[PDB]
Each structure stands twice: as C-alpha cells, then as structure tokens.
C-alpha cells in the first residue's frame, strides 16, 4: 500500500562546496603522532556536493533517485529527525535484489531482499489522537518482500521525534561504499547549531558497519519522514507539511590523502594530494608545512 | 689493539604467554559441514561464525575433505591464530568445478555464480556428496546460473530469473529463440561420473591480525605477567619485549597500535579490556676494549647509556667506573 | 665550563639533536606518553658515538 | 633510516612478526629474505650518504 | 580469424582440468592470440598431470 | 637511466602494460613490485653517482 505525492514544488538541484568534508579512519588500527599517507575511495576537497532541503516554506520534499558512483557522501543537518534511512540498488523493481535501511523510531532494521519499491517512499508521522504527542503512523516503503537474504534487526529503543522549531541541532555524516561484495559504512554524529550550508570544519568518520550484503549498487534514495496533523487541511497525498531538514550528496573517487593523526590517535587534519599545486608540494615532501 | 663496537645489550625472554579471548563455546562444525540442506550455487548460503573456539579436530572422526587449499595462511598455523571476522559461504556445485573455486579463476562458475577476490584470505574446502545429494532419477534442486550479460564481482550474489536476451530481439520477459532462462539444473544421479558428481564446497573467508577477533584456535591461555621480557602471543600475534600499562586510549574497534615504522607498540588484552604497550627489551650500545690478543686475553667492556653510580650488563664483575661515555667494567681508573 | 661569551652565544645559538647521550632503557621505556626519535633510532640499533 | 622500516619489500608485510605468525618456517622464510635484502639495502644507501 | 568467445562450451563442456600458462584466465577475455595453434589427443587420466 | 629501464629485474617484462595485460591484478603485484624496487635501485645509483 503506497501513494503518491502530488503538491511538489520542485527547483533546479542546488551546489554548495565541501570544504574539505568526508575523511574516514581507513583501518582498524591506532596511530597517534604521525603523517601516513593512503590512496582510497576519498571525497575531493571543495568538491560541488548536491543541496537538498525538505521544507515548508514552498512546499518542497524532495527526494530524486540519485545514482551511486562507487561510493557516496551523505550528509544530514537536521533537527527533528527527518531522515531516517536509504533505499540502495539497481534497480528497485522487484527484479533484483536491493538494500534498505530504516529507523523506524523503534528499531534500526537491515534488509537485503527483493523489495517492489514505491515511486515516491516516506515514513509518515501523525499527531495521535490516543495521546497528544508525535509519532510514527505510517510506514510507506515497498509492496512486497520475497528472496529475504539478510536481517540486522536492533533492540528496541525510542527516540524524541517531536518538530521542533530552531537551527539545525545535529549534523550527521556518512560514508557508503561497496568493495567486494561488503557494504561499508562509516558514521559521525556531531552536534552544530546552524541554519546554513555544511559547516566549516574537521571530523573524522569512525567505521561503523561492514555489512555482507553482496549484491550490486548503482542507484539511492532517501526515505523522508512526513509531519502530517490536524492544522493542515488534504487527503494522504496533500494533507502534509515536510519537515525542516537538509541533507547533502557527495560522491566518492580514487584520491591520494595525507592524514595527521594526534597524539591521542584521532585524525585532526588533512590533505588533499591532487587539489592544487600547494597541496601538491605538502604531498611530495609528507608535510603539512612547506619552508 | 683497540675499542670495537659489539652488537648492543641483548635480553632473553624469562617465559612465554598466551592471552586468546576468554570463550568456550565450539564452533559451528556440525552446523555448517552436516547441514541436509546446502544451497545452490547460484544463489549461495553465507553464515557468520563469531564468539567460538577453531578446534577443528572433530572434523577428523567423520569428514574427509576432497580439497583443503588455504590462501593468506599457512595450514599449520590456524590453531595458533584467531580470525577477526569469519563469513563461511556455502553451496554445491559439479565435481570438475571444484578447481573453479580459487582466486583468479576464469569459468561458468568463477564468471556467472560465485566470484573469489585474489586479495583473500581464507580456506576452501570442498567434498563429494554423491551419497547425499544425488539420488535415482536425477536430483534437479541444485541449480546454476548459465547465462549472465558480465562477470560477477568478487563475492556478488545474483539471485534474478530474467530471461536472458541473447540475440537482438528483445525478450519481453518470455522465452523463445535467442531467450533462455538464466538458470539451469544440475542433474545428479549415483551411478553417474566422478567428475559429475556432486560436490560440497564450504569457502572460509577471514583477516588475520588486524581487528579485534572472536573466533580462536584451541591454544590455551595463560596468566599476563608485565615488566620481563616475555614471548607474547596476543590473539596470534607473536613476538618478544616488554609489556607495560598504557595511556594510550584505543577505540572499541581498535585492537593493536603501530608505529611510523609499523611495528606493534600498543596491544588491547583480549581477556581484561586494558591496553599494553610493547617496548623491545634489547637495548644500548656496547664496546670492547682490548689489547692485543698477543699482549693480553684481557677485556674492558664499555656499555654505553646506563648508570653505574639489576644493572644492564653481562657481568658486573670487578671495578665499575662511571665515565661520561657509560660505564667501564673491568679497567681500573687512575687519577693520572 | 671555560667557554667565553662569544662561544656561550654560539653553542645556545645552534640546538643539538641529542643533549647528551646517557639515554637509560627506563627512560625510553618510562615516556610512552612522548615519541621521542632517539629512543626509535637507539631500539632499532642506530647509536650516535 | 627508521621510517624506511614500514616498507614490504614485496613481502607480504613489513613486521617480521605478522610472517612469522601467519606463515611457518616453510613459506616465511623467502618472505623474511626479501624484507632482510631490502633492509640491507637501506642500510647501505645510509652509509653510502653518510 | 577468430572470435575466442568460449562462452558456447558452458553450455555442454565440463572440463576436468583447465590450467593456463603465462597468462591469466580472467584476462583471456581481454586479449588478442597471433599464433594459436591446438595439440589434440587422448591419453588416460592418471597421465593429464605429465 | 633511460636505458635502464629496459631491464625486467626478475619480472616477466620490462613493460608495465605488458604486465598488467597479460596478467591481472591478483598476479601482477609482485611483478610490478619487482620492477619499482629494480627502478629505485637505479635511481638510487644514479643520484649517488650525481
Ligand atoms: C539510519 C540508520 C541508523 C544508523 C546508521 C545509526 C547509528 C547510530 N545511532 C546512534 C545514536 C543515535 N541515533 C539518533 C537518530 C538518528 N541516527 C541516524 O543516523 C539517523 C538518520 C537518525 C534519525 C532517525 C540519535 C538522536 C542518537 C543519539 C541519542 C540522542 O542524543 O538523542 C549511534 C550511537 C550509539 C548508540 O546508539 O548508542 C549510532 C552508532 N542509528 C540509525 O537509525
Ligand atoms: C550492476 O548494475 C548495472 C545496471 O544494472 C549494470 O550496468 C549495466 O550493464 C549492462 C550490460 O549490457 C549495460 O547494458 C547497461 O547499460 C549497464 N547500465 C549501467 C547504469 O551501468 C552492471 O553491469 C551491473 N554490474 C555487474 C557486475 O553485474
Ligand atoms: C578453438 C579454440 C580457440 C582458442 C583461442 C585461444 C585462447 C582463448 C582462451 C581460452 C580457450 C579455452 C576456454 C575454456 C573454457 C573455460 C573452462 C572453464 O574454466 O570452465
Ligand atoms: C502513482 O502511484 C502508482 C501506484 O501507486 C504508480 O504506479 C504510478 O507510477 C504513480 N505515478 C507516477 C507518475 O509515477
Ligand atoms: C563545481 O565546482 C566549481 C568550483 O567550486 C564551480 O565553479 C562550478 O560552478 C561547480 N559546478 C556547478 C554545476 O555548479
Ligand atoms: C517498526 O517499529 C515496530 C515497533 O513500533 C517494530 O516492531 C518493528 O520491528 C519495526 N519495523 C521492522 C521492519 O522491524
Ligand atoms: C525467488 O522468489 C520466487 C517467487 O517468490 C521463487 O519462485 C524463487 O524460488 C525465489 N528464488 C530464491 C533463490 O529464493
Ligand atoms: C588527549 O587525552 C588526554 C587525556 O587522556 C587529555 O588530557 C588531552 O586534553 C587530550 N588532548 C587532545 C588534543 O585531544
Ligand atoms: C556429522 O554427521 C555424522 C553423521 O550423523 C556424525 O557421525 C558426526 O558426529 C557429525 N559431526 C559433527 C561435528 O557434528
Ligand atoms: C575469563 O573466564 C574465566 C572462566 O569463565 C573467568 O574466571 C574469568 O573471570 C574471565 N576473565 C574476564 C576478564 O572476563
Ligand atoms: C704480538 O706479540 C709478539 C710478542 O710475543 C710479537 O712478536 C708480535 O709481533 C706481536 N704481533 C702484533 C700484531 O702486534
Ligand atoms: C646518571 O648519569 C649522569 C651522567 O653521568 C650523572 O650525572 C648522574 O649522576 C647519574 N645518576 C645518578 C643517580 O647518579
Ligand atoms: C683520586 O682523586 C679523588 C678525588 O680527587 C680521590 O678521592 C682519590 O682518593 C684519588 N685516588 C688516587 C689513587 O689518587
């Protein structure tokens, strides 16, 4: 059971610059007090990131199926816990296998599976009747599941999904990429206080997961929640006001980086061999200084 | 006649421990290599193995494996070793298949229905089952991709049934001339050929020291003993030095520490979550002084950075001088 | 020491990478916390005379 | 000198005791001889500067 | 004047032992032969190892 | 030194894409991993001759 949505308000896709953003731990091993250099799957300095911001006011949800080049940068700057999942694949028909991730604000669920996904997915809270407060009423995602071949189910837990009215409270970063049949994320939750682009600044995204999964990913979308209560008048596919978060798109490539890491083992700095020529110079000499 | 540079001071190790995470509980043995059921090739069976003991020496009363090549180790060290994460991937496929199943392989299988990497560290193993999975009549559950548009990435599964185009004419999603169903049947009876015979293959994929580990060899554990020059063996990690506490403040997923020159220096104890650093336990330089050999069998022996105002010396013996090279055993000092 | 001022400005005026060369194995094995690079070159055999 | 520890060599690693660990005395030898002509290697373009 | 796309003998050949000499299988689909030539015989099986 | 680089220094060819077409990257590490350390050789005793 899925519908569409059909009060859209859409725009040409918004750039903003990555200013020197998505830099992940590359092994499981702790250096402190050192220069190492390693060549990977890294998100280029001042790279153009791709905007797209859910929000009222203009009526605009925005949620494109965007490709999966070897790799993807996601970024969500947010406050009322609007994003809350992915959908990766190929093809996301039925036909083949595809990943899902969801938190369905109890549970983080997993699932590698051949979903018929609907055209436009979401997770649509309501403002109950039962008790005056938020939570989730509607779990809007595919039609059928069938060929189930992986299941990461968490513990239970709650989290606060109230729409609060402020600048964005939490930035949450992650780094997907699919290596050998293994799904690789590495995450970093850091708490900002801005209602602007992606923030200046350096922070190093700790492994995660290394799921199994083993299937093919070319193509991904984000599942947005829905803010629907009785101040807003429609039907399922207009009775709804989006959220007020904003999330960023960046895609990986082969790159060779210079990492600083501290004395107490956590990167601080790095650099981008290949950006210009003074980088260029810092990455020939293995120095974060040039005389 | 003269002063000679000897190798520096060098220490023995007093004793040898073995610190392996604190587990009982015997691996999946019997869950994995006595399954009634294993699955297709094409859509193949991958089991997590995690928080158990790599004993096996039960597989010896009852299983004899066809093949056993193991890839990134040594056959003889996986009970002095223990695997960081360790994924079994089983199927069952034809007997002349089974030399398929090897990194950097080319075939209907290695292309279309299971893919190995060559950077793998890992174990295949492989026997027949014809007294299982072929029975009168032709046992037609096994199934295999025949046709596939490109090869398969390493550890890629691939379970779709679309028609495979062939030709130029689309299929539309029916079969016909040039439109074949992807997947074909193994036909496995018993009074059939050994190399058409069915074969269980059971593919063992794991890292070696790098990252916390659940799954060990039988080896037994023994009490940590700090500040001697000991021959360690930290989830299969051997060597020698000296432990001592640590600042150091690992992260849940870090198990050994490194240096510029990439030795280990810092090591996390599998049994009580404390982290050690290792410092090499052979130290300082030393000379010899000595006149001829003709003139005299006498030595002096200088070691150089330590204090002789349990001495770091082969023998303390007679007239220890403190001069500002180090300390000068067996010369006599004059104030000439 | 007998050194004259001009030869005090000198020697502050140039630092030594040693400052001496009694470097005790508890010394080394006591500053875990401080990556020192005499006590790396000392461990892998390389001494200063 | 002390940084150029960390390189292969085109052994399969650049700690003795990862060889030593992973593979017995059969296949770790040729391993250790290709990290020990190479450290002598360095160890003499050192002393060729020096 | 060939197109060595060997993907036809999955279909019916089962090959109890295929092994390449100076190349890669996985680069055969990559590359071009100058001078290829095919050696036929019979000989029982304990001999295909000689 | 440009001469130089017509060495195979124990590899199957002096030539990288010979190397990487013929084998693949599973076999064509230790290949190429021959060649670097032959060619910094060469470098190394060009600069000390310099
Ligand atoms: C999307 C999959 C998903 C991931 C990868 C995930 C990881 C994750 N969430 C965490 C907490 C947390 N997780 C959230 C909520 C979120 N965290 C998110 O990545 C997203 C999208 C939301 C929004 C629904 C919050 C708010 C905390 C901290 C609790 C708090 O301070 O309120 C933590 C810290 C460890 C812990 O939970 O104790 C991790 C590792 N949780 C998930 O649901
Ligand atoms: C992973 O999925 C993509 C898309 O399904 C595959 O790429 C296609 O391959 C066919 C081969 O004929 C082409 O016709 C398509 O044009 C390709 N589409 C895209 C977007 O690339 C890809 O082959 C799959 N990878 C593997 C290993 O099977
Ligand atoms: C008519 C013969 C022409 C041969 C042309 C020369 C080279 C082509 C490369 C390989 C040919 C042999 C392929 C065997 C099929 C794969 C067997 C398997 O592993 O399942
Ligand atoms: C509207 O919904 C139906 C099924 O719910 C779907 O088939 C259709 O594609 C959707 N409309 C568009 C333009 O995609
Ligand atoms: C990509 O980045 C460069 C430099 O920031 C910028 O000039 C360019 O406009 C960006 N591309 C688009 C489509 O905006
Ligand atoms: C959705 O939340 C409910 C509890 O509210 C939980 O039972 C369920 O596991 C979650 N969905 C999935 C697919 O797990
Ligand atoms: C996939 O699903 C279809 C129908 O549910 C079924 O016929 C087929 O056997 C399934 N294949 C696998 C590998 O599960
Ligand atoms: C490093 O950790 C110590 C405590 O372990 C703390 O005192 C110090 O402030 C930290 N320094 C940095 C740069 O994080
Ligand atoms: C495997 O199955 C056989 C037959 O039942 C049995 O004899 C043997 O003990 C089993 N081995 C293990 C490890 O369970
Ligand atoms: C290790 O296991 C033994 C027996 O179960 C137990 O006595 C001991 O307390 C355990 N040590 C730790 C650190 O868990
Ligand atoms: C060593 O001593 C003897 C005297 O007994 C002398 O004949 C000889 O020349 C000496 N040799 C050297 C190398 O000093
Ligand atoms: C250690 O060696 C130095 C230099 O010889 C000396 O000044 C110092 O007194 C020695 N330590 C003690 C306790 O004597
Ligand atoms: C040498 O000099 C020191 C102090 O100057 C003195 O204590 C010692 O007795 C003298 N020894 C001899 C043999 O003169």
Known sequence: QCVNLTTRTQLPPAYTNSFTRGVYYPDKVFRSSVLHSTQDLFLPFFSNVTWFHAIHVTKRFDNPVLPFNDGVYFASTEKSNIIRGWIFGTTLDSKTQSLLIVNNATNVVIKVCEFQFCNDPFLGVYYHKNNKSWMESEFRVYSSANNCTFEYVSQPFLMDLEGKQGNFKNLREFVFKNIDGYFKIYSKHTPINLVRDLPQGFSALEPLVDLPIGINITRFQTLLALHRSYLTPGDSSSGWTAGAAAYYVGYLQPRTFLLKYNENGTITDAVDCALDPLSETKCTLKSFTVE | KGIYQTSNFRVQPTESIVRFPNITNLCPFGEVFNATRFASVYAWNRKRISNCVADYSVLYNSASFSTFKCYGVSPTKLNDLCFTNVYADSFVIRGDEVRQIAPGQTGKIADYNYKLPCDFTGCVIAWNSNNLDSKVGGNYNYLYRLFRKSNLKPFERDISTEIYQAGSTPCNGVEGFNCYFPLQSYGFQPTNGVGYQPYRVVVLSFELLHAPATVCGPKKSTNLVKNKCVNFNFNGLTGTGVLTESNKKFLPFQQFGRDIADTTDAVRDPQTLEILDITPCSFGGVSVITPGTNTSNQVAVLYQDVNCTTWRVYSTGSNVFQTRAGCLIGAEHVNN | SKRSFIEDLLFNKVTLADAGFIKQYGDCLGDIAARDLICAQKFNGLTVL | ?50
């Open chain 4, 1 to 50: 000198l002390v940084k150029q520890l960390s390189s292969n060599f085109g052994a399969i690693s650049s700690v003795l005791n990862d060889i030593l660990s992973r593979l017995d005395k059969c296949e770790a030898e040729v391993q250790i001889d290709r990290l020990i002509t190479g450290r002598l290697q360095s160890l003499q373009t050192y002393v060729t500067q020096q």
